[PDB]
Amino acid sequence: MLSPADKTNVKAAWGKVGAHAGEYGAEAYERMFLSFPTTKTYFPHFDLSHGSAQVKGQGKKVADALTNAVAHVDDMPNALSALSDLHAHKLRVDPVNFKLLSHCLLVTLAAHLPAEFTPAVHASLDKFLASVSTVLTSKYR
Amino acid sequence: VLSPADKTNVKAAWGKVGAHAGEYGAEAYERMFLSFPTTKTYFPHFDLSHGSAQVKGQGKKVADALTNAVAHVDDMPNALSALSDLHAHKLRVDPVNFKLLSHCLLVTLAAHLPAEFTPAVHASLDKFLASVSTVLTSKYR
Amino acid sequence: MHLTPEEKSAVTALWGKVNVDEVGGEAYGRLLVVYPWTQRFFESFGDLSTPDAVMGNPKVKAQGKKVLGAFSDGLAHLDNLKGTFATLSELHCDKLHVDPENFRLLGNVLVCVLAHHFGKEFTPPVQAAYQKVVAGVANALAHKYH
Amino acid sequence: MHLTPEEKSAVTALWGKVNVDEVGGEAYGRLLVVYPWTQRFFESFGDLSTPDAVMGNPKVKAQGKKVLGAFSDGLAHLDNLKGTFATLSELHCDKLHVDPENFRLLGNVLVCVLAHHFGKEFTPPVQAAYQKVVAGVANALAHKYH
Numbered sequence A: 001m002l003s004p005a006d007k008t009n010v011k012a013a014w015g016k017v018g019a020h021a022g023e024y025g026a027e028a029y030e031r032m033f034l035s036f037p038t039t040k041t042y043f044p045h046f047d048l049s050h051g052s053a054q055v056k057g058q059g060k061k062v063a064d065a066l067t068n069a070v071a072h073v074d075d076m077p078n079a080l081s082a083l084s085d086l087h088a089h090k091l092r093v094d095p096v097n098f099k100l101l102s103h104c105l106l107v108t109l110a111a112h113l114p115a116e117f118t119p120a121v122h123a124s125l126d127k128f129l130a131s132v133s134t135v136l137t138s139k140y141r
Numbered sequence B: 001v002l003s004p005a006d007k008t009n010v011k012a013a014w015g016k017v018g019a020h021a022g023e024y025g026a027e028a029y030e031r032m033f034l035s036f037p038t039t040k041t042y043f044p045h046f047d048l049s050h051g052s053a054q055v056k057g058q059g060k061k062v063a064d065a066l067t068n069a070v071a072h073v074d075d076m077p078n079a080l081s082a083l084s085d086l087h088a089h090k091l092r093v094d095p096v097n098f099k100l101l102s103h104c105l106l107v108t109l110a111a112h113l114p115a116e117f118t119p120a121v122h123a124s125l126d127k128f129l130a131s132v133s134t135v136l137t138s139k140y141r
Numbered sequence C, D: 001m002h003l004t005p006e007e008k009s010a011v012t013a014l015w016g017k018v019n020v021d022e023v024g025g026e027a028y029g030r031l032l033v034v035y036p037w038t039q040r041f042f043e044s045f046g047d048l049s050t051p052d053a054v055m056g057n058p059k060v061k062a063q064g065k066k067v068l069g070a071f072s073d074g075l076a077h078l079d080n081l082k083g084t085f086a087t088l089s090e091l092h093c094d095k096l097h098v099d100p101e102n103f104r105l106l107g108n109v110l111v112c113v114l115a116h117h118f119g120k121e122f123t124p125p126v127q128a129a130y131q132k133v134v135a136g137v138a139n140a141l142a143h144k145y146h
């Protein structure tokens, strides 16, 4: 369960990501598609070339959603309501895949912001992304 | 989310199980240990052979916890709090195993309920066991 | 895939008793009811609005019959599931775009259906054998993904 | 597990840069911090009360050194992981009672630690190679369970 110390850590770490959030969202997808090829089954329609506009757009949108969740960490179900509806009713991404993206975001952050990626921050970010994933899959059935 | 229809289906199915709950809990563990042998790593202090009274005892305890969860379906975190503490802080069962036991309890219920294990009731029971599992793992970190 | 002789005998013995078309329609319908995000691949199949509609839908039942017929055929090839399912694996990746986690969900549902139908005869060791098999089939169907 | 020649090359090349004791202590400490239920085996190791106590605990770091030393040696056997880890698999099942999901958690922590330590060099394709390896090692360590 996400604690208020975790909340503080995530606000600090995501605040430090700052303007790089969309870039890092895109890189997390790029990493996921290579490490976990089955996740490409959800993007048969995209150009998955490095640096594509579609991957960068997806990364920016996902980053904005994460920024919204970080700013609203005590009201995430409400903050992410449109997205939990979209994933439950339309996209219908198997819940297992959220773990894979989350791990790839952690790797991306570790690779780019090592000073900030302390053990405690790693633990808080992992918990936070698990929470986001739970919210996004909460309306699946 | 546990909807009123899901709650109704769960209460009806577990009411039918009735006094057999402990027997079924033991059978679920037996099924899990055979189907998923890694789960035996949590019970090195047990005779895990068919008919073991230690497995019977464990099944009765878990069945009784589930009966209590059903009786408190609107107030489940508090009802299960001591068990959440015990699993988080002492037993420290990896979360993946709750999925495995949940499936084996569905299989057990299916094997004993020709009429009652309808598709809708199966779905509600799976949702319920996932919710119990979420509560039981909520204090792990 | 390596099966003990008790396991492979348990699988084949139970399977000869199975009504494959019926079990296939039942398992596939339950997949769509219990894990309704799996309906994403079946937009054209008609009414999937309620459990009774899903279970009674002729296209769902026809899909379950096809799927479990292929599963059944594979049970003759328990020593080389990867080779027996390679063509279908590539189809499911390249044409149908199906996340292989779906195969694992179906395996779980199929085990529940066999328990429901056979009752006490679906004993813990028979279930264990079937768990091995459904895992092996899902792994084989996932093998050609890239 | 199926590593391309270039993936094997990439694994071997990055690993030649690793201080195994250092990375082992970091990865094993982070395992116990991020996934604290893994502490269950280490009641005898002293202070695990805070992230700094875990990371700085001499017993934790000695365990990480031993674990990652064995992992390191296994990278010479990418063609035979099941054989190279068979005796450790049996020990972890029969005597240590370690759920193999712990190996998968360690694998993912190790990937994060390699990213943390290597920065630019831990590119998406290098990560993908290491994901295959940690999966293969966890699978090999799980192989003799029964």
Ligand code: HEM
Residues within 6 Å of the ligand: A039, A042, A043, A058, A061, A062, A065, A066, A083, A086, A087, A091, A093, A097, A098, A099, A101, A132, A133, A136
């Ligand atoms: C942190 C977890 C996630 C968040 C916050 C998130 C958020 C979003 C957002 C903001 C959108 C754009 C919606 C729009 O354009 O209106 C989206 C779309 C989408 N997401 Fe998720 N998502 C997450 C995880 C995943 C995962 C794990 C997958 C699959 C592996 C996935 C697959 C998709 C797909 C297929 C689309 C539609 C893309 C398109 O056609 O443009 N998402 N998501």
Ligand code: HEM
Residues within 6 Å of the ligand: B039, B042, B043, B058, B061, B062, B065, B066, B083, B086, B087, B091, B093, B097, B098, B101, B132, B133, B136
């Ligand atoms: C529906 C999910 C579960 C429930 C409701 C549950 C409930 C319980 C209960 C009521 C006890 C007895 C506590 C006491 O004696 O004070 C217990 C003990 C235990 N449980 Fe859980 N449990 C669940 C899942 C699991 C799983 C998935 C595993 C491992 C695969 C597990 C492993 C254990 C162990 C090792 C003990 C201690 C047994 C002993 O020392 O006698 N439990 N659990």
Ligand code: HEM
Residues within 6 Å of the ligand: C038, C041, C042, C063, C066, C067, C068, C070, C071, C088, C092, C096, C098, C102, C103, C106, C137, C138, C141
């Ligand atoms: C794991 C066991 C499975 C086997 C052996 C299998 C086998 C088959 C076969 C034999 C076909 C017919 C191919 C043709 O006539 O061209 C098919 C089609 C298809 N399968 Fe699979 N399948 C399996 C599981 C699944 C699952 C779990 C899903 C998704 C939830 C899925 C999705 C599809 C789709 C979308 C089609 C095309 C259906 C249509 O529009 O007619 N399959 N499969």
Ligand code: HEM
Residues within 6 Å of the ligand: D038, D041, D063, D066, D067, D068, D070, D071, D088, D092, D096, D098, D102, D103, D106, D137, D141
């Ligand atoms: C890369 C994966 C792993 C490898 C290669 C590995 C290897 C080893 C080795 C070489 C030993 C010493 C064996 C001996 O004394 O003969 C050992 C001991 C042990 N390992 Fe593993 N291990 C792995 C992961 C894990 C994980 C993730 C856990 C649990 C969280 C674990 C728990 C233990 C325990 C409890 C001991 C005994 C420690 C002691 O007695 O001080 N191992 N491991």
Ligand SMILES: [K+]
Residues within 6 Å of the ligand: A099, A100, A103, D108
């Ligand atoms: K992962």
Ligand SMILES: [K+]
Residues within 6 Å of the ligand: B095
């Ligand atoms: K976990």
Ligand SMILES: [K+]
Residues within 6 Å of the ligand: C061, C062, C063, C065, C066
């Ligand atoms: K048909």
Ligand SMILES: [Xe]
Residues within 6 Å of the ligand: A024, A025, A026, A028, A029, A062, A063, A101, A105
């Ligand atoms: Xe992301």
Ligand SMILES: [Xe]
Residues within 6 Å of the ligand: A029, A043, A046, A054, A055, A058
């Ligand atoms: Xe994308």
Ligand SMILES: [Xe]
Residues within 6 Å of the ligand: A010, A014, A066, A070, A125, A128
């Ligand atoms: Xe985040």
Ligand SMILES: [Xe]
Residues within 6 Å of the ligand: A101, A102, A105, A129
């Ligand atoms: Xe994410």
Ligand SMILES: [Xe]
Residues within 6 Å of the ligand: A013, A014, A109, A110, A113, A116, A117, A121
């Ligand atoms: Xe970070």
Ligand SMILES: [Xe]
Residues within 6 Å of the ligand: B013, B014, B016, B109, B110, B113, B116, B117, B121
């Ligand atoms: Xe039931």
Ligand SMILES: [Xe]
Residues within 6 Å of the ligand: B021, B022, B024, B025, B063, B066, B105
């Ligand atoms: Xe039960």
Ligand SMILES: [Xe]
Residues within 6 Å of the ligand: B024, B025, B026, B028, B029, B059, B062, B063, B101, B105
């Ligand atoms: Xe149970």
Ligand SMILES: [Xe]
Residues within 6 Å of the ligand: B029, B043, B046, B054, B055, B058
């Ligand atoms: Xe037990």
